[PDB]
Write a protein that binds this ligand. Structure first.
Ligand SMILES: CC1=CC[C@@]2(C)CC[C@@](O)(C(C)C)[C@@H]2[C@@H](OC(=O)c2ccc(O)cc2)C1
Length: 264
């Protein structure tokens, strides 16, 4: 029961996702690997995942992290974040509604939503039965707990996975997050707001036309609630990373650009 405009809208988003989301991570290469009240808070900020690399020959490398030193993981994390940020940026540039915005609003929207779209893409490779993010030959496993789900990002991934979303519903979440009219520095707030409203209406219509089961009652509102939580997680995590960056630099040039770090 979608209109022609709504079907075309989903087609372009799915087209952009297919072109820019390397679900096997085959082109993620050459990445680095692990070899006073601020440092206190940064110690609280720092804290748990094992890393597995499966070679093409069949060999396997595993890394288990240390206690307390806590910075051995940041270069790899920066490289993964940078790789995912590049895919998110390519995703936005293909979308016609995005590249018709002025370049200053494109930058403002990408600065505000890059993290959120990365986590949404990571949820599609999350395995809730094994607690692992399967990124091709890379795997990030949660180490051995109802106390673990207290962590808001982990709780997000478990709750979003439980909703059993389609590929089309994920890319519409990505569009709704991307076209947030209230990111800092957005000028065409009225245009972005009307674009966001139409992406949300398309999602609402898609769910009503394709999910009649009682388990999917209120699904649209559950998804919208997840996006609000993801934005709150985004804000807390950005302040976490900026405190760590202040104590121990790690941000790549691309992450610096997205964080507004000038280099002086
Ligand atoms: C750059 C990273 C690489 C490994 C991944 C992508 C594996 C999955 C991950 O998103 C997961 C710890 C949520 C993690 C990333 O974790 C986060 O981005 C994160 C973790 C906890 C939070 O409270 C917020 C963000 C870290």
């Amino acid at each position: 029961g979608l209109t022609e405009e709504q079907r075309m809208m989903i087609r372009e988003l799915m087209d952009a996702q297919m072109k820019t989301f390397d679900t096997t991570f085959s082109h993620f290469k050459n990445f680095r690997l692990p070899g006073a009240a601020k440092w206190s808070q940064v110690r609280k900020d720092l804290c748990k995942v094992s890393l597995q690399l499966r070679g093409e020959d069949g060999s396997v490398w595993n890394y288990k992290p240390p206690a307390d030193e806590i910075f051995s993981l940041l270069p790899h994390m920066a490289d993964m974040s940078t790789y995912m940020f590049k895919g998110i940026i390519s995703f936005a540039k293909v979308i016609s509604y995005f590249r018709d915005l002025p370049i200053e609003d494109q930058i403002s929207l990408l600065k505000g939503a890059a993290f959120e779209l990365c986590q949404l893409r990571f949820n599609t490779v999350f395995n809730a039965e094994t607690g692992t993010w399967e990124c091709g030959r890379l795997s990030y496993c949660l180490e051995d707990f109802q106390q673990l789900l207290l962590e808001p990002m982990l709780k997000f991934h478990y709750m979003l996975k439980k909703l059993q979303l389609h590929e089309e519903e994920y890319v519409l979440m990505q569009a709704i997050s991307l076209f947030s009219p209230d990111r800092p520095g957005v000028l065409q707030h009225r245009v972005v707001d009307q674009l966001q409203e139409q992406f949300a209406i398309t999602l609402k219509s898609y769910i009503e036309c394709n999910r009649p089961q009682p388990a999917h009652r209120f699904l649209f509102l559950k998804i919208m609630a997840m996006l609000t939580e993801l934005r709150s997680i985004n804000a807390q995590h950005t302040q976490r990373l900026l405190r760590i960056q202040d104590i121990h630099p790690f941000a790549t040039p691309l992450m610096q650009e997205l964080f507004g770090i000038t280099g002086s």
